[PDB]
PDB file of C-alpha atoms (C1' of nucleotides) in Angstrom:
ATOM      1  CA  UNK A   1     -75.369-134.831 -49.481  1.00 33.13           C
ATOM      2  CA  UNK A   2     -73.547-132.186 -47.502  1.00 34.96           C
ATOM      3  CA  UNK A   3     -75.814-132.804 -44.403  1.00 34.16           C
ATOM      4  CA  UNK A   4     -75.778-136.826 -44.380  1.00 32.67           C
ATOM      5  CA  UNK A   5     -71.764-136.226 -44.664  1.00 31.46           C
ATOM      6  CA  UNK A   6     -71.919-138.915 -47.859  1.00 29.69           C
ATOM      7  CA  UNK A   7     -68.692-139.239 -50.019  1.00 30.18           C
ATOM      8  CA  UNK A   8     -70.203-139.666 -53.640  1.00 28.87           C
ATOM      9  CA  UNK A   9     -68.585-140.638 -56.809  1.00 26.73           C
ATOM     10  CA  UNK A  10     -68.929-140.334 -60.323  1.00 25.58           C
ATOM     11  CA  UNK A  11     -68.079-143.813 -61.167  1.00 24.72           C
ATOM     12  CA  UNK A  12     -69.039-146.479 -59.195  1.00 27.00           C
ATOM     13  CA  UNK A  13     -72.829-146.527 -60.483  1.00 23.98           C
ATOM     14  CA  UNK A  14     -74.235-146.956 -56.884  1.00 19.59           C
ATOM     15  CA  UNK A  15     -72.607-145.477 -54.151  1.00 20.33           C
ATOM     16  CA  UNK A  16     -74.842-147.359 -51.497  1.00 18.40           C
ATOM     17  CA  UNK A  17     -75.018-147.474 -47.661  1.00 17.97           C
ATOM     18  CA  UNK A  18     -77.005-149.638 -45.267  1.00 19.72           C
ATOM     19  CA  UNK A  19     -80.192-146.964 -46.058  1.00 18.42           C
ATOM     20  CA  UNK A  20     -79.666-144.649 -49.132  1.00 17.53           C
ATOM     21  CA  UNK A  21     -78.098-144.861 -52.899  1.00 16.61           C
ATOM     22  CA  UNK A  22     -76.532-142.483 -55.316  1.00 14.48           C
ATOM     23  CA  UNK A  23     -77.281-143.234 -58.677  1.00 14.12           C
ATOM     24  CA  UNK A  24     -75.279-141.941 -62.030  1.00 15.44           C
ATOM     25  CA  UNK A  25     -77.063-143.195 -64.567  1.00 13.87           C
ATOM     26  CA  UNK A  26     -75.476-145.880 -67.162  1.00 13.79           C
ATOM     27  CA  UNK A  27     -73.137-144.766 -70.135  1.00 13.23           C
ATOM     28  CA  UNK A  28     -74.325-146.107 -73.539  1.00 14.21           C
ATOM     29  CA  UNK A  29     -77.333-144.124 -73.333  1.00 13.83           C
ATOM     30  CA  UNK A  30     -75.399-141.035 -72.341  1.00 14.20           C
ATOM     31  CA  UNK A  31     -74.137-141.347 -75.593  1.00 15.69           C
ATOM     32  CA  UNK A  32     -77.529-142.683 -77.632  1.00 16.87           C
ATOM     33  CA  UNK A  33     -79.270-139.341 -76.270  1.00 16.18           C
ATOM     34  CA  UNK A  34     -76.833-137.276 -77.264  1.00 20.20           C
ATOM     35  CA  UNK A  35     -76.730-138.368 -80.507  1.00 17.37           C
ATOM     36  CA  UNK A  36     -80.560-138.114 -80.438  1.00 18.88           C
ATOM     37  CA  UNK A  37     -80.039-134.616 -79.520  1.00 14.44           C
ATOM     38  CA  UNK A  38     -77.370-134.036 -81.963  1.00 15.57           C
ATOM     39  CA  UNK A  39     -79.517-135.664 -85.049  1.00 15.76           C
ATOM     40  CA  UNK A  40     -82.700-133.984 -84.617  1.00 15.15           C
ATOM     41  CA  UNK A  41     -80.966-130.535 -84.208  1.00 18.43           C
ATOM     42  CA  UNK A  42     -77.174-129.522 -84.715  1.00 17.34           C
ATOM     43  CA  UNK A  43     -77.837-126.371 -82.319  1.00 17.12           C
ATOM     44  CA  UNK A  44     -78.521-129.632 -79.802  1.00 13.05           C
ATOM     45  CA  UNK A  45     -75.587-130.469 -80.403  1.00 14.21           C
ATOM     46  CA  UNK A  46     -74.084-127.250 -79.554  1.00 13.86           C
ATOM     47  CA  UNK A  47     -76.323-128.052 -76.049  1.00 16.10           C
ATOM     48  CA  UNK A  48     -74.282-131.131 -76.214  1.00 18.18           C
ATOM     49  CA  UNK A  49     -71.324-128.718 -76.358  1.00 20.30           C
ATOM     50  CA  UNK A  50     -72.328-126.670 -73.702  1.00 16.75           C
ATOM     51  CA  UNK A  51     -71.108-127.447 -70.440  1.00 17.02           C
ATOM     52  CA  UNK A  52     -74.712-127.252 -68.856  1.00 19.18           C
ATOM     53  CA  UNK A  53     -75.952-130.617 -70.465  1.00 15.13           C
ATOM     54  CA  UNK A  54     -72.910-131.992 -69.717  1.00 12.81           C
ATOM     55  CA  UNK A  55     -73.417-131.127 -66.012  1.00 13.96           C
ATOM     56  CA  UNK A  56     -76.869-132.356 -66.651  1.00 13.33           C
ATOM     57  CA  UNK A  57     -75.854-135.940 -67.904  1.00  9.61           C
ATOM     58  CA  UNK A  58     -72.490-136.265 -66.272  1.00  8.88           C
ATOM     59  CA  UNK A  59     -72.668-133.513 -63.297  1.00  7.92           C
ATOM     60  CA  UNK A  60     -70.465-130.879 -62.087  1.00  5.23           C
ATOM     61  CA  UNK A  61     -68.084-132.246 -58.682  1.00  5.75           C
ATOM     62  CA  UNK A  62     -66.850-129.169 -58.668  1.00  7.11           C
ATOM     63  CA  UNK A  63     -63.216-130.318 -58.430  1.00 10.27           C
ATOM     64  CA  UNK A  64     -61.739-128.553 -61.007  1.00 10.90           C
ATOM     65  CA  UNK A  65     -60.550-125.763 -58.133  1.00  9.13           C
ATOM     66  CA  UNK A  66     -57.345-126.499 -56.813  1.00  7.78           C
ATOM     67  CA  UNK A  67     -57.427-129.626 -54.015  1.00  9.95           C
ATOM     68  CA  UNK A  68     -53.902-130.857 -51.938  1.00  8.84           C
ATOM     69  CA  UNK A  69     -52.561-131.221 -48.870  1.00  7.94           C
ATOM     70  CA  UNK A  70     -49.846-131.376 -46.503  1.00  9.99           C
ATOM     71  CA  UNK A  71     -48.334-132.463 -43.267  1.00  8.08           C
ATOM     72  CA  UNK A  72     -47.331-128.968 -42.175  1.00 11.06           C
ATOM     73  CA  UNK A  73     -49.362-127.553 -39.522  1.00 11.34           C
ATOM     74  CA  UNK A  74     -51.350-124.472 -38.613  1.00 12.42           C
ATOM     75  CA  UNK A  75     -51.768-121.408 -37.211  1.00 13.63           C
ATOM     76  CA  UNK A  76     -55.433-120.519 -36.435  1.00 12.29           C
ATOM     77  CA  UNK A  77     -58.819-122.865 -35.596  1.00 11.60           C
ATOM     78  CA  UNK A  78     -62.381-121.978 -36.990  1.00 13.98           C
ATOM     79  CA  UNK A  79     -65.931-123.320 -36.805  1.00 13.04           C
ATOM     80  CA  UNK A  80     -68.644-122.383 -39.414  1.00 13.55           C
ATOM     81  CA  UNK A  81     -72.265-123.923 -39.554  1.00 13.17           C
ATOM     82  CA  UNK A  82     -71.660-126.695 -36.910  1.00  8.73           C
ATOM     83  CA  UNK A  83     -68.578-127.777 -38.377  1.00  7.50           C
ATOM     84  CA  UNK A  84     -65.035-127.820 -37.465  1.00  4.85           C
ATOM     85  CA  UNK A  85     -62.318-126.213 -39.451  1.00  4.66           C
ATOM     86  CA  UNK A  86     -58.463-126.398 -39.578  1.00  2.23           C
ATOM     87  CA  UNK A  87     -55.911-123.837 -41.461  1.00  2.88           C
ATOM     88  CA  UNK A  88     -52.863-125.586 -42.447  1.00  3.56           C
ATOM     89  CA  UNK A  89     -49.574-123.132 -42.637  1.00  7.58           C
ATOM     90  CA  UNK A  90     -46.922-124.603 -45.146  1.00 10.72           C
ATOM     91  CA  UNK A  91     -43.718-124.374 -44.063  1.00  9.16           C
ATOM     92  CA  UNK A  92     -42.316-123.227 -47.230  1.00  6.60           C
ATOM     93  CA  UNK A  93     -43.920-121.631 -50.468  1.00  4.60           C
ATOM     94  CA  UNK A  94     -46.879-120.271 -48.207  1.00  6.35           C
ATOM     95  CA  UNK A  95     -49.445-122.511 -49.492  1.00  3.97           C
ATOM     96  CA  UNK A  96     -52.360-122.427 -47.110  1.00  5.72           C
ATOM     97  CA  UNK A  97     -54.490-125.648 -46.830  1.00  3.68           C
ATOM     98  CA  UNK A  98     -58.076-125.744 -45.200  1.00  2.00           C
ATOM     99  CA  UNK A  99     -57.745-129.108 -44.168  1.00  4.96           C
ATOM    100  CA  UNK A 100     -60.211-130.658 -41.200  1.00  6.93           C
ATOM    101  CA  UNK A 101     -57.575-131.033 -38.695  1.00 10.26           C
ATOM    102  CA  UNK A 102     -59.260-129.873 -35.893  1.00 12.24           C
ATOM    103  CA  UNK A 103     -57.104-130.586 -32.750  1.00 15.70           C
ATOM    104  CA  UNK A 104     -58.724-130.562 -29.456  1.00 19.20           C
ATOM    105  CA  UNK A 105     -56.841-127.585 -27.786  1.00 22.58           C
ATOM    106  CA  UNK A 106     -56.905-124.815 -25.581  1.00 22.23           C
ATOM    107  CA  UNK A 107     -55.926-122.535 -28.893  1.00 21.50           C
ATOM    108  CA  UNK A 108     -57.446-119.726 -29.910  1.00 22.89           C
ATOM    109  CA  UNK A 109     -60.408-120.392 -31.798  1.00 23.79           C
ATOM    110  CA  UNK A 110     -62.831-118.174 -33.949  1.00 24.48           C
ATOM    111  CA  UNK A 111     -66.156-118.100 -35.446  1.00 22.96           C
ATOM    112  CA  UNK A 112     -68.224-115.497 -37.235  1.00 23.32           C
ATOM    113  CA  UNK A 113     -72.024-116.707 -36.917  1.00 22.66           C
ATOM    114  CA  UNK A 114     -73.134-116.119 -33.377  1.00 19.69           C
ATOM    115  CA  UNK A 115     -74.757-119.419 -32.918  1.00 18.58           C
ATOM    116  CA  UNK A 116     -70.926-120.748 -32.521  1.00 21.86           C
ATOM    117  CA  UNK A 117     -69.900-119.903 -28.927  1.00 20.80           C
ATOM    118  CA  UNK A 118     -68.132-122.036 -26.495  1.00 21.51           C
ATOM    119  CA  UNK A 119     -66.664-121.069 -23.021  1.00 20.71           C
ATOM    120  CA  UNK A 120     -63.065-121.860 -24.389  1.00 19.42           C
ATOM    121  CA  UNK A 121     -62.950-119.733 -27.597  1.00 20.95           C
ATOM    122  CA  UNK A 122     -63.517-116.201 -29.134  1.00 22.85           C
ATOM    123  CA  UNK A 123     -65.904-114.094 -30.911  1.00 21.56           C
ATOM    124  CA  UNK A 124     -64.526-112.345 -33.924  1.00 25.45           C
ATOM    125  CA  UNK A 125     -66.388-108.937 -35.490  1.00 27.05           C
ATOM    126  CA  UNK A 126     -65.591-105.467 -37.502  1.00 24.21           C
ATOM    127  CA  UNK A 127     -63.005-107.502 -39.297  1.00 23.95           C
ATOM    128  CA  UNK A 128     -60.808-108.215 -36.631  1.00 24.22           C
ATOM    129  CA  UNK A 129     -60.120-111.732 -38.345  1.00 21.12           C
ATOM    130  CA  UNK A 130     -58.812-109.936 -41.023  1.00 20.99           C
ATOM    131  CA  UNK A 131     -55.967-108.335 -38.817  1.00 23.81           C
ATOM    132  CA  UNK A 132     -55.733-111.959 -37.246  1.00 26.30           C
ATOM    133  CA  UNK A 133     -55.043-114.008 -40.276  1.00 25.87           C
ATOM    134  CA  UNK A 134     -53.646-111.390 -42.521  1.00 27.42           C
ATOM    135  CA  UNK A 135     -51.507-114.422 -44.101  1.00 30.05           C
ATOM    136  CA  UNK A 136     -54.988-116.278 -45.082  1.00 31.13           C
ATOM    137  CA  UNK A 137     -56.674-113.490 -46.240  1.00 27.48           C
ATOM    138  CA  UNK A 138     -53.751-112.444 -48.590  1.00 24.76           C
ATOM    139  CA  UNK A 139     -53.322-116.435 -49.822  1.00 25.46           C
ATOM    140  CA  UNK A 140     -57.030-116.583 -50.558  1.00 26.57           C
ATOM    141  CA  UNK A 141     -56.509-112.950 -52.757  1.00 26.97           C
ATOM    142  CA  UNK A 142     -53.782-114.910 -54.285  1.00 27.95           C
ATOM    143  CA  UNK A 143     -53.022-118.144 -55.491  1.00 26.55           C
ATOM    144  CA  UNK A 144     -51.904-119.639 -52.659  1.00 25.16           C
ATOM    145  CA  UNK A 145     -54.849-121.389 -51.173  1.00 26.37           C
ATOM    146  CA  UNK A 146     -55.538-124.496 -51.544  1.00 27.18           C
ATOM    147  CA  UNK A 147     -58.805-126.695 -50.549  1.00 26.22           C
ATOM    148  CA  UNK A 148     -58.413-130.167 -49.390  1.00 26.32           C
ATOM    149  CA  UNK A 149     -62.068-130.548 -49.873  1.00 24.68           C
ATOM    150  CA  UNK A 150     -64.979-129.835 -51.938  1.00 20.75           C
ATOM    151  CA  UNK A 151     -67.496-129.521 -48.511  1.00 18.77           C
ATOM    152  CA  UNK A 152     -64.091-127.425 -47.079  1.00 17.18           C
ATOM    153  CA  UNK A 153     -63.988-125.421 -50.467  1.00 17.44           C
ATOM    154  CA  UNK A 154     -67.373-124.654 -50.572  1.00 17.63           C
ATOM    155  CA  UNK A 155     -67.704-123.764 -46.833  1.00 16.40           C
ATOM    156  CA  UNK A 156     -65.053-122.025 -47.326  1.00 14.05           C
ATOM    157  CA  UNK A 157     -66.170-119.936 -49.855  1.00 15.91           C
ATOM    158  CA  UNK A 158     -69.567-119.073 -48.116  1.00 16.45           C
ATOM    159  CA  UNK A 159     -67.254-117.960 -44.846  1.00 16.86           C
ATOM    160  CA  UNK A 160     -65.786-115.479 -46.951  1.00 15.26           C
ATOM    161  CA  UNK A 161     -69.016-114.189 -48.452  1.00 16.38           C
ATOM    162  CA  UNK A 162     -70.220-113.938 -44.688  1.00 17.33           C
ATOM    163  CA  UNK A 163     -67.137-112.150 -43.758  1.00 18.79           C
ATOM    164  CA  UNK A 164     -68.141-108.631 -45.526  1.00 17.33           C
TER     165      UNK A 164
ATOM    166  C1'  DG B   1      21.134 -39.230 -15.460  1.00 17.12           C
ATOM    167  C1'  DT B   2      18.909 -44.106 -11.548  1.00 16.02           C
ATOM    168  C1'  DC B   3      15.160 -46.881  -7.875  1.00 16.90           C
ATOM    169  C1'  DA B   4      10.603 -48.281  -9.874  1.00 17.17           C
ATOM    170  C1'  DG B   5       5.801 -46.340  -9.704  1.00 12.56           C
ATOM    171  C1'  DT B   6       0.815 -45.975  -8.878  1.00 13.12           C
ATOM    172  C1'  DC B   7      -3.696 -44.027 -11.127  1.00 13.67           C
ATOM    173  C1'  DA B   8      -5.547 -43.707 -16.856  1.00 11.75           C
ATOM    174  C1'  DG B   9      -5.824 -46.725 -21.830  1.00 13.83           C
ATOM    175  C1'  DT B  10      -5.671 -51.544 -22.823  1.00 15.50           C
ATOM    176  C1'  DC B  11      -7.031 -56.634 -23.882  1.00 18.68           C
ATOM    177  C1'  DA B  12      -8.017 -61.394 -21.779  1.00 13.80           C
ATOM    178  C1'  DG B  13     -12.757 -62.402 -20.093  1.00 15.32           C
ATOM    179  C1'  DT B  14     -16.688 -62.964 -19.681  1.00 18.28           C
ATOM    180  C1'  DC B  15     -22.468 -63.052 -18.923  1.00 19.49           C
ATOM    181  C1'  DA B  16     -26.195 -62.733 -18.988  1.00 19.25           C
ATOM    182  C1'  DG B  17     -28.992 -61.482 -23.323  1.00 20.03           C
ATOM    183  C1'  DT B  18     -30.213 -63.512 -28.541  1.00 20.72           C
ATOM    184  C1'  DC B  19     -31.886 -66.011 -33.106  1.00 13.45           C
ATOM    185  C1'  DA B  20     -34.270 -69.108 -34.847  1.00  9.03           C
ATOM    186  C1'  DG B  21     -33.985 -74.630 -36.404  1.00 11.04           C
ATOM    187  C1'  DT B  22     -36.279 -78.325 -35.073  1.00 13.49           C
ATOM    188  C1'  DC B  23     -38.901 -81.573 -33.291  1.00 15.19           C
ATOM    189  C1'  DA B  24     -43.818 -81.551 -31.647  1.00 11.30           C
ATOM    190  C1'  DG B  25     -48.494 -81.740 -29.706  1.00  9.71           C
ATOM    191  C1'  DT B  26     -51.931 -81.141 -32.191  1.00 10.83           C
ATOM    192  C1'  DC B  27     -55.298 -79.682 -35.286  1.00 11.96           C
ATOM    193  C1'  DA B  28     -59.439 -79.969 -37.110  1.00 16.28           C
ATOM    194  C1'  DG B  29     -59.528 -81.768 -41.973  1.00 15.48           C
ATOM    195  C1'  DT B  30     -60.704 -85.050 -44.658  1.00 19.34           C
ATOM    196  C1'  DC B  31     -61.445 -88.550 -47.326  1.00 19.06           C
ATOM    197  C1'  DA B  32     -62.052 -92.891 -47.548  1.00 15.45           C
ATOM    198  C1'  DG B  33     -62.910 -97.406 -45.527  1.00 15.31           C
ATOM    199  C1'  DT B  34     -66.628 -99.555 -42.640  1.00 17.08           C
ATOM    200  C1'  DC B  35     -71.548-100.338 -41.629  1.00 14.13           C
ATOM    201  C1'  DA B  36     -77.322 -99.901 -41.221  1.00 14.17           C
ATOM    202  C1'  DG B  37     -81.970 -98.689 -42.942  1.00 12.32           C
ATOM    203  C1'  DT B  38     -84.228 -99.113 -47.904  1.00 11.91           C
ATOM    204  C1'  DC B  39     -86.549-101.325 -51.220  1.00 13.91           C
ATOM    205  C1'  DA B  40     -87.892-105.519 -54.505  1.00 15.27           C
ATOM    206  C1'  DG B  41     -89.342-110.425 -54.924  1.00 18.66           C
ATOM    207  C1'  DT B  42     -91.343-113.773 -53.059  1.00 18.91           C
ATOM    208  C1'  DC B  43     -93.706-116.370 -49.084  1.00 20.48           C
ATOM    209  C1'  DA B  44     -97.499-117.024 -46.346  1.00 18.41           C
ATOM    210  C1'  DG B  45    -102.411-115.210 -46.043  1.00 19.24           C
ATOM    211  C1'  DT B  46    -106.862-111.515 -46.078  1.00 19.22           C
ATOM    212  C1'  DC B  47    -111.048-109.735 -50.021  1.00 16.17           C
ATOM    213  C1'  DA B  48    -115.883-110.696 -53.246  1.00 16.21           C
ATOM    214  C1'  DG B  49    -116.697-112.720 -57.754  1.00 18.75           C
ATOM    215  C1'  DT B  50    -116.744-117.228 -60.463  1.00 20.35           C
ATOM    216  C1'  DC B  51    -117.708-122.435 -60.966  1.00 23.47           C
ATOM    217  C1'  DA B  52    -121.272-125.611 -60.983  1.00 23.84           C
ATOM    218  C1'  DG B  53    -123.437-129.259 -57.401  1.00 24.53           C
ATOM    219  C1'  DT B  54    -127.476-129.644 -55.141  1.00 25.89           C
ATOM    220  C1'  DC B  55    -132.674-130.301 -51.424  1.00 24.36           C
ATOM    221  C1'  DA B  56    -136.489-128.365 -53.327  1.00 21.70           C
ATOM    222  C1'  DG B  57    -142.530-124.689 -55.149  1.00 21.84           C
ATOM    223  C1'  DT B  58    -145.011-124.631 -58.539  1.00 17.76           C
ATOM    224  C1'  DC B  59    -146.986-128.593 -61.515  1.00 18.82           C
ATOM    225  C1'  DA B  60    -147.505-134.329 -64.917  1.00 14.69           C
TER     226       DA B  60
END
DNA sequence: GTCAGTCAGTCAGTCAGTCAGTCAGTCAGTCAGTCAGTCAGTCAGTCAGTCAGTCAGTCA
């Protein structure tokens, strides 16, 4: 899904293009084989109350972690795994959005993998990014971060395990 | 007894010598914050024993 850029949804039953679906199967029998599960077996039903079957019938979106953002602008410019990346700076409250707004400038730019290199931007190693955006670092250690996206949040996340 | 002095003690004055705070390179120490081979699981492939399928040497 990540790779064919798709926006699904956990409603609309078919989330179709010109080539491909997304299918999330129909409700009422949601319901008839989980009370299936729940009458042959009660610790089924305790499946039924764990969150994996539910991710299993109804599916995780992941967007329980936080998700906003802002018309304030940014600091900094990034590019991980062939795609662009944007750090939004609020103006007040510091809270730092990840938001795609890449703007085609002459800004300092930084990447981590070494298949990203362009004859306009920079090369970051031995933590140097970490005395660069001291700010982002800190908001990601606290609360302040927020993802705009679940590909952003995700990518996001896998950045910062590359980063160590 | 005046004129008022003109070669030693005397005090107004140093004058190079003096102590040691006080920052200060700096010192390797060091200990801790960063980073580079190490191995375990798993992936593809090598051994030499199975299956178990089959043209055929001695006979109907």
């Amino acid at each position: 899904f990540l790779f064919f850029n798709l926006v699904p949804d956990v409603n609309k039953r078919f989330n179709v293009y010109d080539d491909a679906l997304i299918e999330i199967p129909d409700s009422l029998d949601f319901s008839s084989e989980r009370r299936k599960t729940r009458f042959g077996r009660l610790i089924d039903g305790t499946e039924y109350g764990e969150m994996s079957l539910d991710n299993q019938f109804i599916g995780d979106s992941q967007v329980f972690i936080e998700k906003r953002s802002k018309d304030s602008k940014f600091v900094f410019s990034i590019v991980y795994n062939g795609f662009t990346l944007g750090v939004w700076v609020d103006v007040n409250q510091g809270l730092m959005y990840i938001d795609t707004a890449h703007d085609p400038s002459t800004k300092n730019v930084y990447t981590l993998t070494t298949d990203d290199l362009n004859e306009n931007m920079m090369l970051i190693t031995n933590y140097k990014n970490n005395y660069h955006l001291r700010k982002l670092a800190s908001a990601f250690m606290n609360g302040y971060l927020r993802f705009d996206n679940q590909v952003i949040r995700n990518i996001a996340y896998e950045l910062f395990r590359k980063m160590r």
